[PDB]
Amino acid sequence: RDCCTPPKKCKDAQCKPQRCCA
């Protein structure tokens, strides 16, 4: 589960500092 690719995942620290999340 990537932080921006479907299913995007923007909730954990390993995904928050991501333009597609922050």
From Swiss-Prot:
Compartment annotation: Secreted
Site entry (Important for binding sodium channel), positions: A13
TM helices/strands, residue ranges: none
4-hydroxyproline found at: P6, P7, P17
Alanine amide modifications at: A22
Cystines in this chain: C3-C15, C4-C20, C10-C21
Outcome when changing Q18K: Increase in activity on Nav channel from eel electric membranes, and important increase in binding to rat Nav1.4/SCN4A (seemingly irreversible) by potently decreasing the rates of both dissociation and association to rat Nav1.4/SCN4A channel
Tissue: Expressed by the venom duct.
Record PTM: Hydroxylated; hydroxylations improve the ability to block Nav1.4/SCN4A sodium channels but does not affect folding.
Family under the similarity heading: Belongs to the conotoxin M superfamily.
Known function: Mu-conotoxins block voltage-gated sodium channels (Nav). This toxin potently blocks rat Nav1.4/SCN4A (IC(50)= 19-110 nM). It also moderately blocks rNav1.1/SCN1A (Kd=260 nM), rNav1.2/SCN2A (IC(50)=2.7-17.8 uM), and mNav1.6/SCN8A (IC(50)=680 nM). The inhibition is reversible. In vivo, induces paralysis to an isolated skeletal muscle preparation from frog (cutaneous pectoralis) within a few minutes.
Domain notes: The cysteine framework is III (CC-C-C-CC).
Miscellaneous information on this protein: Negative results: does not or only weakly blocks rNav1.3/SCN3A, rNav1.5/SCN5A, rNav1.7/SCN9A (IC(50)=6.0 uM and >100 uM), and rNav1.8/SCN10A.
Name recorded for this polypeptide: Mu-conotoxin GIIIA
Residues of the full protein shown: 52 to 73 of 75
